[PDB]
UniProtKB/Swiss-Prot annotation, chains A, B:
Belongs to the class-III pyridoxal-phosphate-dependent aminotransferase family. L-lysine binds at residue 156. This is L-lysine-epsilon aminotransferase. It comes from Mycobacterium tuberculosis (strain CDC 1551 / Oshkosh). One of its GO terms (molecular function) is pyridoxal phosphate binding. It catalyses: L-lysine + 2-oxoglutarate = (S)-2-amino-6-oxohexanoate + L-glutamate. The modification N6-(pyridoxal phosphate)lysine is found at residue 286. It is an enzyme of class 2 (transferase). Keywords: Aminotransferase, Pyridoxal phosphate, Transferase.
Length: 435, 435
């Protein structure tokens, strides 16, 4: 089967609604994807839906003969890491703890898939609340609900379908729990400190009302620190700081879903580190390759929590060993080359360019925003946004939509300023055409 | 970090309740695992919880230089296969369809994880029932419940926690849907045709009552063709044939969870092929490396089902590309070496040996049973069963428990008769010690 027959072969078995290209696995590199059909190079601001930290075929992985041997050893088989331990696994775990670890969150758990990472954070909270209730004379049947935000995306699995609320297509006709959902007080243009404070106060009021009308039954609050799929919606640290206090007042855990924000994209290991709010549990995935949770803080106050008791959380494989070996090497590169700091600096650059675009096209380029390399802007209508994406595709630049009117940038951590300039140049070319 | 420090390193971050050994990834091969600490070889009747079809480091994969290059190309990166197609992916899909495909079930969907494979089968059914209801004048809010069996294991995710019912430890304190659950009329010793028929009739009665008291609200019936974790419980074809008719009468889909039974273990591609019952959806995982569903039959009667409409089912990665490349090669070996037939023949051999054990130890070795290489026997008590497993471990044979009193055999498809003899010899040595 040849590159030009790929879409035909897949089309016999599946819906083929992806990109028009066929990925050349060998010739792609860094910030560029190569179409195996034409040999055309595409500038990658999409990074497999923000799951690639270093881009395709990074030199530090490709040129490392010792790593090749390690990777090959892992890739030939697929052990059940939950039952059977290896040096390859232990090396990954120790470097994860070193590079991304938080001393307050020592409990680590790994699984395949971002939705399942979030689910296991939820399971930890449900167990914790039930047991905490029981220890304080409250019915252990209580503690089954999840406070969450409007516009949230946490995945497409059994529990996360009850949380995710972006496009109706994702959740329609699937059974859901009736869990309390509150307004998301995200930052928007033309709102000053007092205006933002009032918006936050209303979400806080709704949150308080949920806790008070469902006594002892809310196990946790879950949020993305920055809402990705919902449209790159940013929140003030003040909002999460207030939620942290409110969670503590009602003995509920605070969970950050860092599946999209995590592993350096915002300029720190985790976005929460810049918001100065301490979570009890963090769910991670995408860039980490293997998914999972880190837990601690109040979790430890219940001695028989799911991290202390065998067989409460599990899967067959306990994450993919190949992903663990790849991730170990990726984390070593991040640490050695100071890629978090590079993300801060290049992120400031990208943001500055988007500000310039907003000045040049004031009625078209709206609400330029970002933290680190996680940047976005919006257009007046969905039609304008969709057209800009088509125009960029024609110019060999890959970006992703979000929400009704957002264009998202998700470059690799290794993106150069010249590559950012190229992306911006394409947007500038395309804009007069869309207007 | 050295083999002797693996448990210490992992123990800082996780609960370390797995096997005492450290897996040597290089020296393990075929039906043998190697402990990196001692160099002791362990006879493997466990195969990473039945997820290894060919055992460790199969020669056809290890000696194939062309495959090495293909695997390395896949392993270096992790593309989002849902968005971005490759030759490596298309080759996997076409060989999957060739080797394991069913002409009645042309729709394929891939995902990481067995629980998520089952969840996507459920999502397909929920959507189908709602839309089928709508097309026939019935409220589209109806069609949200899942008929399932006692003793079932379908995973540990949001929807599957409402189905799984083996050990309380798996499901306690996690929120569940109230879905209808019926008795499992599995075969047991000392029950003749009429006795089995009466047991089945009672389960059928319970099933009928569920359909009639929850009108238009049961979307599907889900079952394992042979219950694995619940204790290798086998069902007569007559039971599933009756359930098939009953599902059709009430316009509900029939889903087989073949995550444990699938990919040749029972002697055919799928266990359902030997039961002569046609499912609408099959969920697969474990041995297939990449997980997912095959769908067809009645699914196609709803033209806007989830396999026809974009973005109803999805994940970031669409399965792991490394797993796809490995699985392609594994399937080619199965096809080329006639491993399904080998499983039939060696399975008959293993079963014969267990019958002999039952004759020699009539009060201790109970209910010897199996289909293909999926074989088991039971002991009088849980204490006897647990002790036998410890005694086998001491003799370097790895087997898995199931239920309260079952010992399961899960050899690779490539197991030899001498290796089966070795396993049986160890059981014979251990039994006088446990009695």
């Amino acid at each position: 089967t040849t590159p030009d027959r790929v879409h035909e072969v897949l089309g016999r078995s599946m819906l083929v609604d992806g990109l028009d290209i066929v990925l050349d696995l060998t010739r792609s590199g860094g910030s560029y994807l190569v179409d195996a059909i034409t040999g055309r190079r595409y500038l990658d601001m999409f990074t497999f839906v923000a799951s690639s930290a270093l881009g395709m075929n990074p030199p530090a992985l490709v040129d490392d003969r010792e790593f090749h041997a390690e990777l090959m050893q892992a890739a030939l088989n697929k052990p059940s890491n939950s039952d059977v331990y290896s040096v390859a696994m232990a090396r990954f775990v120790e470097t994860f703890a070193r590079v991304l670890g938080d001393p307050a969150l020592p409990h680590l758990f790994f699984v395949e898939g971002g939705a399942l990472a979030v689910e296991n954070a939820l399971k930890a909270a449900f167990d914790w609340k039930s047991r905490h209730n029981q220890a304080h004379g409250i019915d252990p049947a209580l503690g089954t609900q999840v406070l969450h935000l409007r516009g949230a995306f946490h995945g497409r699995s059994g529990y996360t379908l009850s949380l995710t609320n972006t496009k109706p297509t994702i959740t329609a006709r699937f059974p859901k729990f009736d869990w309390p959902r509150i307004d998301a007080p995200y930052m928007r243009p033309g709102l000053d400190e007092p205006a933002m404070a009032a918006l936050e106060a209303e979400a806080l009021r709704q949150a308080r009302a949920a806790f008070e009308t469902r006594p002892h039954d809310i196990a946790c609050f879950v949020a993305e620190p920055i809402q990705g799929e919902g449209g790159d919606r940013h929140f003030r640290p003040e909002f999460f700081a207030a939620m942290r206090e409110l969670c503590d007042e009602f003995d509920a855990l605070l969970i950050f879903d860092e599946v999209q924000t995590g592993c350096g994209l915002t300029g720190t290991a985790w976005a929460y580190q810049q918001l100065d709010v301490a979570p009890d549990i963090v769910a991670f995935g995408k860039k980490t390759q293997v998914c999972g949770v880190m837990a601690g803080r109040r979790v430890d106050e219940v001695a028989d929590n799911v991290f202390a008791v065998p067989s409460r959380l599990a899967s067959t494989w306990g994450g993919n060993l190949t992903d663990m070996v790849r991730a170990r090497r990726i984390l070593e590169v991040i640490e050695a080359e100071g890629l978090f700091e590079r993300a801060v600096q290049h992120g400031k650059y990208l943001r500055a360019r988007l500000d310039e675009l907003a000045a040049d096209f004031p009625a078209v380029v709206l609400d330029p925003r970002g933290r680190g390399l996680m940047c976005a802007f919006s257009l007046p209508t969905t039609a304008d946004r969709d057209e800009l994406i088509r125009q960029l595709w024609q110019r060999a630049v890959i970006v992703l939509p979000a929400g009704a009117d957002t264009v998202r940038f998700r470059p690799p951590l290794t993106v150069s300023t010249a590559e950012i300039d190229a992306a911006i140049a394409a947007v500038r070319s395309a804009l007069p055409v869309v207007t």
